[PDB]
Each structure stands twice: as C-alpha cells, then as structure tokens.
Amino acid sequence: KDQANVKGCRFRVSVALPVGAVVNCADNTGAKNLYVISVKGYHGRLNRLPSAALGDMVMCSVKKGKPELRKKVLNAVIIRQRKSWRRKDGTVIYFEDNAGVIVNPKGEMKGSGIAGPVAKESADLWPKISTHAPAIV
RNA sequence: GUGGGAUUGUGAAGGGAUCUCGCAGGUAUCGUGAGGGAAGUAUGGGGUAGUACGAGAGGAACUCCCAUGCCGUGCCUCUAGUUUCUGGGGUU
Ligand SMILES: [Mg+2]
Ligand SMILES: [Mg+2]
Ligand code: NA
Ligand code: NA
C-alpha cells in the first residue's frame, strides 16, 4: 500500500502511543529515538490525545541521535508496541519495546536496515519496511 | 329499606327523634397505544482506472464490497485493571 491513510486497510489495533510518547528508532539512519508529535489520519475529539498504534504514520522529532536528524519534523511508521492488541484469530500479542522507522511522506524508508522484528500489520501496510524486516511477527 | 355509628358543654336509667356513613366490588394475567421522547453520523481503501477529459503536464466519480473514526446501546467468552475470598504461600 505505502499510502499515508491506513485505517481503512487494516483492522482495529489498540492505541498505544499518545502524543509525547518516546519510542525507539529501529532503523540505522543514526537516530536513537522518536518523539510522537501527531498521528496521520487522526480525527479529533475534545481532550483526546492523538494516539498511534502499529502501522500508523506519525509526525515525529528526534530527541537523541546525530545532530542533522534533530530539531525537525520527520515522518515515521510504528512497527512495535508494548500495548497488547487482539488479532482477529483471537490471539493477544505484544512486544517488549516500542519502535518505529523513519520514512518520507510517501512511505519510503530512510535508512536501509531494521533492528528487531516488525509486526505483520505494519509490514502489510508498508512493503519497504516488510522487505527490510529481519522477521515478520 | 338494611346495617353500623353518633348528637351540645350540668349526674343516672330506660324511650323516641334526627343526622351521618356502608350496601358492590375484589384480586391475577395478557394486551391496546393516544401523547411524549427519539439517533445514527463521517473518513479511507479495493474496483471503476491511470480511464473519461486532455497537446501534454496531469487527472474524476457511482454500482458494488473491505475496513476504520466518532457517537449510541449493551456484554464479560477472551486479554487487561481491581482483592477484606485478608484464598494460598512467603517474609520483618
Ligand atoms: Mg482540553
Ligand atoms: Mg478478574
Ligand atoms: Na408519538
Ligand atoms: Na485477570
């Protein structure tokens, strides 16, 4: 797909990462973490923090990492979350950590490698991440 | 008419008289539905299609069908939270 709007292409996933969450960066661009600024395709409700889950594209800034990647608004895709979600086949699953990868607004991954497993939901929404994943889980 | 009560405050006991009230409904279901309230609402993807239009750059929509926000009404199989079952352990 690699299209910014993903909600109508993937099933319900429990929201894990509200605005202000800091998640690890799984790529090798040089960034260490990502600061969730907002979530693509989020429709607001009064007082509700925009919250990301797997496969979502987020706006982010880099808080720790090499200087050229910092002090900017970047795009990123969530690939792991600690909050558990229920898959349609009934299985409840979660990751040990939260992680994301830096992308351009059209879904192309900056960086050429991914550390750790990628959720199947995220990989189905984004083929480039899927090809770079060392395991789809 | 029948019954039961009662008259105004200065004893007692019997007589009337006059009022007032009751005299037919209880109890248990299934329904009607006047009137009132009132609620669903959006986005995306597939396909149409890279085609109609267009020199070209670019570039649509509906039958359909697949999701997802929000809102609403519930529920507790699962997963999560909660424990004064102070349940069972452990430990100062
Ligand atoms: Mg507020
Ligand atoms: Mg319980
Ligand atoms: Na009515
Ligand atoms: Na439990």
Which secondary-structure segment (H or E) carries A132? helix A127-132
Q: How far is the CA of A96 from the centre of ligand 4 (A)?
A: 20
Residues 6+ apart with CB under 8 A from A47: none
Å between CA of A39 and C1' of B18:
96
What tokens appear for A135 in the block?
């395991």
Whole-angstrom Cα distance, residue A33 to residue A25? 5
Q: How far is the CA of A96 from the centre of ligand 3 (A)?
A: 57
Contact (CB, 8 A) for A56 and A6: yes
- C-alpha distances in angstroms, A81 versus A9, A34, A56, A66? 19, 13, 11, 24
Contact (CB, 8 A) for A10 and A124: yes
Å between CA of A89 and C1' of B31:
47
Tell me the longest C-alpha to C-alpha distance in chain A.
44
DSSP E strands: which ranges in chain A? Answer: 17-18, 22-25, 33-39, 51-52, 57-61, 74-80, 85-86, 92-93, 99-103
Contact (CB, 8 A) for A94 and A85: yes
Q: How far is the CA of A124 from the centre of ligand 1 (A)?
A: 35
